[PDB]
Each structure stands twice: as C-alpha cells, then as structure tokens.
Ligand binder design. Sequence first.
Ligand SMILES: Cc1cc2nc3c(=O)[nH]c(=O)nc-3n(C[C@H](O)[C@H](O)[C@H](O)COP(=O)(O)OP(=O)(O)OC[C@H]3O[C@@H](n4cnc5c(N)ncnc54)[C@H](O)[C@@H]3O)c2cc1C
Ligand code: HEM
Ligand SMILES: Cc1cc2nc3c(=O)[nH]c(=O)nc-3n(C[C@H](O)[C@H](O)[C@H](O)COP(=O)(O)O)c2cc1C
Ligand SMILES: COc1ccc2nc(SCc3ncc(C)c(OC)c3C)[nH]c2c1
Ligand SMILES: COc1ccc2nc(SCc3ncc(C)c(OC)c3C)[nH]c2c1
Lengths: 460, 58, 229, 402, 57
Amino acid sequence: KEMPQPKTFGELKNLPLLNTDKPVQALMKIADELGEIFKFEAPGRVTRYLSSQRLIKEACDESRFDKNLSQALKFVRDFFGDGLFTSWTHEKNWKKAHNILLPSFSQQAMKGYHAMMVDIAVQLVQKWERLNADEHIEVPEDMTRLTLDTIGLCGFNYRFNSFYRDQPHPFITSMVRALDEAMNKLQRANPDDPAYDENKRQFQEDIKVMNDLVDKIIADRKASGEQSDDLLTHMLNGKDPETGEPLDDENIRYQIITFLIAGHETTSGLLSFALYFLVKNPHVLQKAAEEAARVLVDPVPSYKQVKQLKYVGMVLNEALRLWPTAPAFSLYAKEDTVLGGEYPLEKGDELMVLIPQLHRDKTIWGDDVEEFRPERFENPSAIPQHAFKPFGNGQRACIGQQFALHEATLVLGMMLKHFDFEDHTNYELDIKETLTLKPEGFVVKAKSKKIPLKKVRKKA
Amino acid sequence: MMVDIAVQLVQKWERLNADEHIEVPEDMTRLTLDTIGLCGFNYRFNSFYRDQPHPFIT
Amino acid sequence: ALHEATLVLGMMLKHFDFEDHTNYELDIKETLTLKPEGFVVKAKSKKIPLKKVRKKAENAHNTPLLVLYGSNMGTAEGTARDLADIAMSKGFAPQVATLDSHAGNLPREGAVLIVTASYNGHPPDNAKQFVDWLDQASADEVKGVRYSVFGCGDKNWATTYQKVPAFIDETLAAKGAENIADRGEADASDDFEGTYEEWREHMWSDVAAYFNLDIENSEDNKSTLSLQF
Amino acid sequence: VDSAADMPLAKMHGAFSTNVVASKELQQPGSARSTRHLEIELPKEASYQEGDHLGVIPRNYEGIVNRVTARFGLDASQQIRLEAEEEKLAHLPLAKTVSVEELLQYVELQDPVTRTQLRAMAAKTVCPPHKVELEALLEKQAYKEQVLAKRLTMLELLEKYPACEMKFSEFIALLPSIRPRYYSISSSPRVDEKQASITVSVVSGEAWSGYGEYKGIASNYLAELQEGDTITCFISTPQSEFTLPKDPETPLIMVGPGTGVAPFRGFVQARKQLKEQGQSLGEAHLYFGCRSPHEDYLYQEELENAQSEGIITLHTAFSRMPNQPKTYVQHVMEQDGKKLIELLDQGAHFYICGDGSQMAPAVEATLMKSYADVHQVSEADARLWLQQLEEKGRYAKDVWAG
Amino acid sequence: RNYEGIVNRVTARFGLDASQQIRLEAEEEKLAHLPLAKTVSVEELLQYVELQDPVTR
Ligand SMILES: Cc1cc2nc3c(=O)[nH]c(=O)nc-3n(C[C@H](O)[C@H](O)[C@H](O)COP(=O)(O)OP(=O)(O)OC[C@H]3O[C@@H](n4cnc5c(N)ncnc54)[C@H](O)[C@@H]3O)c2cc1C
Ligand code: HEM
Ligand SMILES: Cc1cc2nc3c(=O)[nH]c(=O)nc-3n(C[C@H](O)[C@H](O)[C@H](O)COP(=O)(O)O)c2cc1C
Ligand SMILES: COc1ccc2nc(SCc3ncc(C)c(OC)c3C)[nH]c2c1
Ligand SMILES: COc1ccc2nc(SCc3ncc(C)c(OC)c3C)[nH]c2c1
C-alpha cells in the first residue's frame, strides 16, 4: 500500500501544518481523517505518524526499531545534551547513566522519597486551606509549584520554594520559553533567516537561567554534607557496573537539567488533567473521594497507604489515556523492514507514535473512547501489549514512571480527602502545547472539609 | 489562628536551601499583616504565597 | 501585639540558629513608624533535630553472590539489583546479569539468586535461552550450584501465576539442587514488598548459616528491642 | 466505654469484638477427645456466606503464660514498658506501660525455635557444654531433625537451660506476633444473618518435643470459652470459592469426615431453607467418617434429620467399630463409584473438606480411579478429567493440615 | 490506694466487673486527674479518685 498524506503547500510540502500553537491536536485531527498511518513531509525530511495499536505493536519491537530523536528532541538536546532523554541508545553515555541512575527508582529509593513528597503535598493542601472565601485556585500553576518542588527536594535536596512565590519560579519561565521556541522552530522553513536572531538570543538566555540554577544545586551539594542519598548522590558517586566508570562532569549537568524538567512538567500536566476530568465527572469524583476518605485515615499518608489508592490510580491512568502529557515518541528502522505487511521501510526511516490516537483505538478500547471511565483500568492485565504507552517503550521507557505515579497518587489522594471541588466557571478545556500538554486557564474553587473543624463554644 | 500564620513563617524558613537568606522586616510584615487579617477579619492575605510585598502593603 | 510577637519570636528561637552574616549596620527606615531597612540574616534549622536516614557500608567484598534476572519491564531487574546492593553491604562479591546470559554458566561456587517474572506463562525476553537450556538440556547437570529463586508475578494472571520462577526452581532441583533458601513470591496485585521482605530476611540467614555471612553487615543485627519500664 | 485491647492483628484482619452465644461439646461422654461447637454473634457491619471462614485472634492459655513468668521469676501483674528503635512484625505496644501477662497475649509462645532465637540464647549462656549444645542445633541437619521435626520451642529450651541469662524483655522481642486461626463457618446465613457457628477440633497430646503435654493455642482457647465471653474475630472469604451451585437441582457430592463436616453443615442448612421456600432440591450425597457413633459422630441427630427430610443422602464410615473392618470414606466412595461418576457426568459439584494431608489425597485418588474403571480410560485421562472438573469450578477443597 | 471493700461497693452498685476495660472523655478541665482518651480498667480508674468525701452540692 501507498500511505495517505495530509494536504500539501507546494514546495513546503506539509511543513505549514505545524504553523499552529497546537500542533499535536492538529496531527490528531489529521489522524482521525487519514487513519492508522500517514506520511508527513517537510523540505528534506520525512516521518510517518502511527495511530493504531496494530502498527504500534510492531514499532515497539526493539529488535526492529530503536528510539529516534524527533526534530523536537534534536532542538531540546541543545540544553538536554546527552542526558538520558536526548541521548541515542548507542551513545556510551546512555547505558552508563541508565545503569547508574536506575537504582534511584528502586523500591527502597521510592520509600525513601515518600517523606519529602509529603512535605511538598502538605504545602499545597495548606495553601488551599488558607484561601479566603470565594478565592480560586489556578490549577496547572499550583500543580507546577508542587511537581517542580517535589523533584527539586526529592532528587537534589534543593528547595525551589515555589509556594512562597506569587509568579512562576524563574526556572519555569525560561523552561516554558525554551520549550515554546523548540515547538515553534518545528514549522520554520528557514531557521537561519536573521528574522530569528532574537529568538536564538532569548533561547540562549533561557538556557543560561536554567544552567545557573544547575550550578547552584551542584554548589549546595559540594557544600552539602551529603548523604542526601538521592538522585544527585548517584550522579556524583555511582559507578556503572558494566564499564566500571562514573558519569563525568559535563554529563552530570545535563542529567540535572533533564531530571528537573522531565521530572516535573508532565506530572504537573497529569494532575491538572486528572482534576479536570474529576470535576467534569461528578460520580467519578465522588467514587475517588470515597476511597481517599476510607484509605487515608492518618494525618499524613503513609507509603503503604498510597499504594492502597487503587481507584485514584485508575483515575490517573485514565487521564493519561485521554491526554498523555508527553504525547509523542519517535523510532527509527534498524534495518529494512515491512510494517503491517503493507508498508515497506528502509533502514533509518522514522516513525512517530501519536500516543493520544493510539489511546483512542476503538479496536482496543471499544466505541466509547472519549468517555472518562477509570473502570477501564480495573484489571490492567487485561490491556493488550503496546495499547497504553504514556511512559514510552522498552529500555527507553520512562525511568521516572513510578516516581510520577506515586507523587500524583499521593497528591490527588490528599486533595480528595481534604476538599470539595467546584468547577465554578464551567471551564472549557483548552490544551496548551509546549511539546508537552497541559490545560490552560483551568480554575476551580476548593471548599475545605476541615477534614471537619467548625466549633461550638457559646455566644449565648 | 496566630499559630497558623507563625507555622507558615517557620515553614518558609525550614524550606530555604543552603546559603539562602531571610529578608527580616519583609517576612515579619508577611506574618503580622496575615495575622491581623485572619484573627481580626477571617480574611487571608496569603502573603507567604507572594514574592513581592502584598499590594495593600505597597 | 505582645502575644503574637512573643509566640512568633519563641518559635523562631526554638526552631533555628541565627547568623548575622553580613554584619548588618542598623539603618532605620521612617514611615511615621520605625523599622530596620535591609536587615538580613541566615537561619540554620535545628531540625528541632532530623538528620537521619548512613551506613558504614563497604559493599560487595567476601563470598560470590551472582544475581540473575528475567525481566521485560524492570520490576525483576530492579529487585535483582537491589539484592546485589544489599549483598555488597553484607560483604559479598555480587554480580548482576540477565538469566539467559549465564545459560549453562551457573556458578559452581557461592550461590546464585534468581529473580524473574512470567509473561502469560512464559519467560521474559532475556530469560528464554536460560529456561530452554534448562528444560531440554539437563545433561550438563546443575550440581554444585547453590541457588534460591524469587518470583515476580501478578495474581491477575490466573493459571500462570509464578509459572516461570516455579519452573526454574523445581527444575533446577530435579537436576541436582543446592537450594539453600526456599523460593519467594511477589504479587504485584497486593503486597509485593511484604513478601519480598519476608523472603529476603529469611534468605540472608539461610545463606548465612550455610556458610556465609561475613564481610560487612554486622553479624549483629544490631537491632535493639525495647523492654523499658 | 467497654473497649478491649485493640490488637494490631485484630485491626489487620478487620476483627471486631463480639460475644459467644453458645459453646458446647460435640463428642460423646467418655471420648478421649474433644470437638467444640461455638455460636458467635456478629455486629451489623459484618456478614457472611456459606464456605466463609471465621478468623480467630486467640489468647495464650494460663498454663503456658505461667511457664514464662515462672522461668523469668515475674509476677503476671508486673507492669513494664518496652522500647527498641528498630521495626517490629512482633506488633508490641512500645513506649506504653502494660503488664507482663498482657504483653504475653501479643506473641506466639510455641512456634519452633528459630536460628536467631538460638544464637541469642547461645550468647547468654554461661554453661559451656550448654552453649555447645544450643549451637549444635544451628546445623542444617540437626535443625531439621531436632528442631523442626519435633517442634522444639524457645520456651522449652529456656526451661531446659535455667542458666541462660536471657531476660524477659529480650525474649518477648524475639518472638513472632500472634497469628489468627481460621475456622470453616458451620452454619448458613439463610437461617440467621447475624449469627455464625464453628466446629473446632481440640488439639491436645504429648508434645512431640518431649516436654510434657501439648495444647494447640486457638483450639484450647476456643474450647474454654463460655456463653457471654467475648472473642475477637473477623470474616475471611477464601480465594478458592466453596459454595453451593447456583441451581439447587444441580447434584452435590460432599466428603467431610471429622471436623471436615463443618462447612457441609452450612450447606445442609442452606438447602433446608431453600426447600422451605418451595425450591426443589436434587441429589446431595454426604460422605462422613469418624471413629464411632459411640464417640465422634458430630451432628448425628441433625444429619439424620436432614436425610429424613430429603435434604441429603448420608453415607458413613467408621474406623473403630468392634467386629467391623476399619472403614474410611474413600472405601465407601469406591463401592459407590458407578453412581458417583454418573452424577459427575450429569453435572454434579464435588467438595472435600477436612484433613488435607492424608484424607484429601486418598479421596482424590479414589475418585480418579472410579473414573478410570467406569469409563475404561488411563490414569492420565482420569487426571485430565479431574483437572477439567476443577477448571469448570466443580471440584472444590476446604482442607487443612490443621 | 482505695481498699478492696470500697472499690467492690462501687462496681457492685454499677453492676461492673473490676477488670472491665473502658475509656473516658470530656473536653472540659479536670482537677479529677483522670487518664482520658486511654483504655484502663474500672478498678484502676477507681484508684484515681476519692470515694468517701462528703457528698457535694
Ligand atoms: C482454611 C482453613 C480452615 C480450617 N478450618 C478448621 C475447622 O473448621 N475446624 C478446625 O478444628 N480446624 C480448622 N482449621 C485448622 C485451624 O485453623 C487451626 O490450625 C487448628 O485449630 C490448630 O490451631 P491451634 O492454635 O489450636 O494449635 P497451634 O497452637 O497452632 O498448633 C498447631 C500445630 O501444632 C502441631 N501439633 C499437633 N500436635 C502436636 C503435638 N502433640 N506436639 C507438638 N505439636 C503438635 C500441629 O501439627 C500444628 O502444626 C482450618 C485451617 C485452615 C487453614
Ligand atoms: C506522567 C509523568 C510522565 C510522563 C507522561 C512521562 C513520559 C515519558 C516518555 C513518553 C518517555 C519516553 C520518551 C521517548 O521515547 O522519546 C520518557 C522518558 C523519560 N522520562 Fe518520563 N514521564 C513522566 C514523568 C517523569 C519523571 C517524574 C521523571 C524523573 C523522575 C522522568 C524522567 C524521564 C527520563 C530521564 C526519560 C528518558 C529515559 C531513558 O531514555 O533512559 N519522567 N518519559
Ligand atoms: C502481558 C503480561 C503477561 C503476564 N503474565 C503473567 C503470568 O503468566 N504469570 C504471572 O505470575 N504474572 C504475569 N504477569 C505479571 C508480571 O509478571 C508482573 O508485572 C512482573 O512483575 C513484571 O516484571 P518485569 O517488569 O520484570 O518484566 C504478566 C504481565 C503482563 C504485562
Ligand atoms: C511535530 O513534532 C513533535 C510535536 C510535539 C511533541 N511533543 C513531544 S513530547 C516530547 C517529550 N516527551 C517526554 C518528556 C519527559 C519531555 O520532557 C519535557 C518531552 C519534551 N514530542 C513531540 C514532537
Ligand atoms: C514630626 O511629626 C511626626 C513624625 C513622626 C511620627 N511618627 C509618629 S507615630 C504615629 C503612629 N502611631 C501609632 C500607630 C499604631 C500608627 O499606625 C500606623 C501611627 C502612624 N507620629 C509622628 C509625628
């Protein structure tokens, strides 16, 4: 078969389709129109967008395809370097860092992050307890305060103190600007037009703000009487069992920036989407709130208690099904090969996995794919292989999956124990793209359950 | 309610990183304005959630 | 004012040590009222005390503990590497590798911990060569090999629950076993860290007494008890 | 008001506290053995189904508590307070003052001695030959043969070694947390939703360790309770379903000698109510076995009445009747092979309850052999048949080693 | 400590067993210096109080 292709613009081919503030949502609409596979061409460049579990299960065969750096990821390597996220699988620094840092996400490590996660989660619950009547909550803004602080503290013993700030932290402002620019670059026909001279200048200055903060974390630790037995301890001290070598200084700096960003942005997104879907599905909200009350009997949650929050877990996975917050990953053909018995590929050919469309495959999920139904995840075993991939694939899957989920589950559990929520504006979903996805402008009001406090006495 | 605000001030300071410092009268104003706001009027200025002084203080 | 000030200053003084790090020169700002301007300090928390997880661990130094895994999604692989990390703390000389990479090369000395999952009744991609070698091939007997098996499974998989760890465990024994420690199981659908914890503590001791146990990791549990009043 | 030591173990099992409404002996006057029947009240929040288990948190009996306080020279009532800093499956009230006797209700006093326990004792022993002996017990072979095979306890070794300088607070802390014991509910909720019965064989004999007389902890606790006493328990539902078919005309075969009859008494009570509600009942064969009708034929009157009202057909086997061959249920089953196998061919459910170490396997072997003989197939085909029967949900076990 | 005779007169009047564990609570102060929010037998509660002071208004 010859594969479908969306509308073209003469010599620019499909490039102008990416001249939009919401390019993943545009791609999704193209998929709905064209089906499980389409070609996307730009001047000098081709990739193939996959949307069906039928093809994606083959794309996920690591003997035939390896992780590719998409254009997006190539632009982000400018600051992520050969950190774990933007390193090729065959670069020496990939397997070395993988081996050195995987022990930071072991069960024992996770147990040891719990207390610090609780620290930040208590800061978020307190901010909301302390709002006055009729004040509201900027949801993704507060979720970013919480997630950035949580990776800062758990990973690096560093306090961004985002809940002590009225604007976003400077690191977040430059992160968002840098991601925005990488995203806008995707559509540029002539990236060296001098019209983009200012764009590049702002880009370097944002890269600088982010690296200045990295330098501070490193300086604190050198001061840190440090056991701080955490991710940074492993970066500076662990040896790869294979080579016998530790990470060098340059790579460690890329790891820190990588983990500060990957370690919070997509978790912020998930919590924001999860709260969004709960307020729009009051019966689901009540069922989740019931579990929180039932399970979280103590003044702060325990590790074992968070693991007890099954339905909350289901809520989060269902939010990731509809709106996976890192919505695409890319693969390349290790050798000539045929996809689906119908689409020949040559060695090196690129594929994009369009995760939100995979997550809407009616052959897997049934006809009601737009509904928010956490019950889909009541037995996760039931889900076929490669049908649900919000954390990517194989040895290049998300290293921080358990950390994100533990954090999200803890936080959402606390929110649901401690407050009633109101969608007071009847908020219309508006999805902001910064390569990653997040609701923009989402606001709610939260009425404290005083876990009960209103007291008597008499003014009699 | 005084304890509520005082715990907010102790927490801000517990949560600073190594070698960060404290602007004393600025933080004392966050605490005192919030304390009269809350104790007197059940109103939360939320000054510890702000990086600049509250507009009312300015 | 006095109650508030007294409460606040009392808390500050309980909770921190203060440093006048700039050697601040008093500068009094007037707004009809008076206040120091530019006054800054640093506050070092007294953790009202907290510092407190670091092991006098020196690791992996020194009977030979080889840990092999069968893993597709890393649960079994992290468990394996965790074990090798606690072995290092208990003076062993641990080695971590996939299962089907020591297919035939089982250690004829020390012990071999085998941590593996199951996939619909089948071995993970990095364990298939091992099991096949184990199933048909039996000629190259497994005598001398003192092992133990830890199972990663999910009760959500009915009829296949822990089939691969079980296969390996009992097959290894119908070929000349030095099973030093009874197999252990983890149900992802319930309390995987409980069982993993049970099997582990029992495990170290089984191998301890058997020989081991002495290259770090106080023979002393150095665990206290209470017995107060 | 009124509250009892909340036990962690009671919280872990959702055990609630409640009253004993009846407690009586089931064996005949002059039986050398005892089997108890207890009726228990359930609170509003609890409920149960046929084939559910009662989880019982037991107490250690006086004899064994006194052996400990005697060994340590302590008074039962002596209040004391523990502490460690280290975790504790032993689920002890730490940093609280609590008497010795109540501390002793949190722990297992007759589990085999563990290797940690032996080392702790060796280290406090100032009797050199006595230290050599305790250490001898650590070796792989001795430990299997002298400790595990005979169920030799730390307590029995402390009594044997009065100059082992271990102290009470180290003893208590080295012991395992007290475990619940499960009993197969012997009544149907269709008769009274808020009342449940259990049927408890009383463990008693000469200790295999050689140290006097052995009593099983929960079973003797249960045996000594009386109307109005309280008891801490919870309802437990087994992973393996053990319930009557959905359709009351589906035929049943039940094998349940001794206390194994327990869950079938619930089945019988259920069928009896369904009849009284106009439902028709099919065939139901109960194979019951015991020493003698002069001794341990539990619920004889009820089971004979049931049979008279067409609720069951009753087949007995007696091991010790003078002038009769020693008979077990599997011998009777084998005589009835043809009929039992035709029934299973028509969709019968088969159930076994009771002793899982000897009785169940022999019953299973007899069923398979009846199949093989009736259908003229191999033992392998008969084994596959049974495997398929179990996978259809028609061959269920409620058996125990206890 | 209060002697047995007088403790038994109280448990008899209330139909209580000496050993019956129970737990009190008020919210209000208490010169009566009682272990509140703890479980404690009747007989030991009765060692915290005066049983033969004249009856107060
Ligand atoms: C699913 C299930 C359902 C059950 N249903 C019933 C039931 O309905 N009715 C019933 O009566 N039991 C039932 N049991 C068994 C029951 O739970 C208890 O195990 C039994 O009552 C014994 O516990 P115990 O505390 O009295 O004795 P324990 O103190 O636990 O001692 C038990 C151990 O002592 C051993 N022992 C026996 N004799 C001696 C001896 N002379 N010297 C040394 N050791 C000895 C036994 O072999 C066993 O290992 C059931 C068990 C299970 C798992
Ligand atoms: C819901 C939250 C998360 C989502 C949806 C997400 C998603 C992903 C995806 C899709 C990939 C694969 C990318 C590719 O194939 O190009 C990935 C990789 C990665 N993730 Fe996550 N992630 C989340 C949370 C986190 C957290 C909390 C951390 C850090 C603690 C993190 C760290 C990383 C790292 C370092 C990689 C690269 C791993 C490697 O290739 O070795 N992620 N993530
Ligand atoms: C597709 C699939 C099939 C599985 N099959 C079984 C099985 O047959 N037996 C079992 O005990 N668990 C089964 N599991 C549960 C996994 O073994 C459990 O998640 C294991 O912890 C995963 O380990 P790993 O990440 O190292 O690969 C299965 C899981 C998946 C995703
Ligand atoms: C057209 O090309 C695109 C467009 C959007 C895209 N979004 C992505 S998702 C890429 C991504 N994934 C995971 C993490 C953890 C991450 O860290 C911030 C990023 C940037 N890739 C894209 C490629
Ligand atoms: C030369 O005239 C002056 C100068 C300074 C002054 N400072 C003051 S003190 C005046 C004052 N006192 C108490 C309170 C509670 C207060 O509230 C803000 C104010 C403004 N009077 C002055 C008069």
